[PDB]
Structure 1
Amino acid sequence: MNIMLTLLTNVTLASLLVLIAFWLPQLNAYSEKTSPYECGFDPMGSARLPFSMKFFLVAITFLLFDLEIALLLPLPWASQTNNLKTMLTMALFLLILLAASLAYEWTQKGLEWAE
């Protein structure tokens, strides 16, 4: 309830700022003013063409490591259990496997960008 009211207040304030921005000042638009900016010269192609991503493997590894951090997050509560030895073994197991994944990718050159 309170969080919803806060979110509504913030979004309303931002929208009001946009509305004031687009209606208060004097407007004068023509084709040259609204054309895309490429440092004074017309763009040769289009900005919607494919843009090669030289770190494509690191993004997938980031997805997997995001899973790893999601698994690791409930650790502060897991340390309140009586099975401390088992919990410690499992936490260290997960972190060692994550380290092994990082080392394997590093040695197999998955962290290097495409040329």
Structure 2
Amino acid sequence: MNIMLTLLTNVTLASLLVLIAFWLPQLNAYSEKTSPYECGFDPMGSARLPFSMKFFLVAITFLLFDLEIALLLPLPWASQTNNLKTMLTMALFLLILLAASLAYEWTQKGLEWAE
């Protein structure tokens, strides 16, 4: 409830700022002013053409490692268990497998951007 009210307040303040920005000043618009910016000359192509991503593999590895950290996040509560040895073994197992993934990709050149 309080968090919903806080989010509503923040969104309303930002929207009011946008509304004041777009309605208070004097406006003069013409085709030359609203043209896209490319340092004084016209753009040759379109900004919607495909843009090669040289780190496409690091992105996939990021997805996998992000869910690894999702697995790792509940560790502070896992430390209150009576099975401390089993908990410690499995935590270190997950971290060692994450390290193994990083080592494999690093040695197999997955961290190098495409040329």
Which digits, 9 at most, give the CA deviation of each residue in 1:19-53, with x for residues without a partner? Answer: 00000000000000000000000000000000000
Return the offset for 1:101: 0.0
Report the secondary structure of 1:50's partner residue: coil
The whole-number CA distance in structure 2 between the counterparts of 1:68 and 1:79 is 18
Question: Counterparts of 1:23 and 1:67 in 2: how far apart (Å)?
Answer: 45
TM superposition shift of 1:88: 0.0
Q: State the distance in 2 between where 1:4 and 1:70 align.
A: 26
Q: Which runs of 5+ in 2 are unaligned?
A: none
Distance apart, 1:90 and its partner CA: 0.1
Instruction: Give, in whole Å, the separation in 2 of the partners of 1:103 and 1:71.
Output: 20
C-alpha distance in 1, partners of 2:54/2:103?
20
Match of 1:80 in 2: 80
Q: Displacement, 1:79?
A: 0.3
CA distance in 2, matches of 1:105, 1:32: 50
1:2, 1:69 → 2: CA distance? 30
Q: Give 3-state SS (helix, strand or coil) of 2:81's partner.
A: coil
Q: Deviations over 1:40-88 (max 9, x none)?
A: 0000000000000000000000000000000000000000000000000
Query: What residue in structure 1 maps to residue 43 of structure 2?
Result: 43
Paired residue secondary structure (1:37): coil
1:1-115 correspondence to structure 2 within 5 Å: 1-115=1-115
Distance 2:21 2:102 in 1: 48
RMSD of the alignment, in Å?
0.2
Q: Which runs of 5+ in 1 are unaligned?
A: none
Provide the secondary structure at the position in 1 that maps to 2:85: helix
Identity in percent: 100
Q: Give the TM-score, by structure 1 length.
A: 1.00
Aligned mates of 1:13, 1:65 — CA distance in 2: 37
Shift of 1:9: 0.1
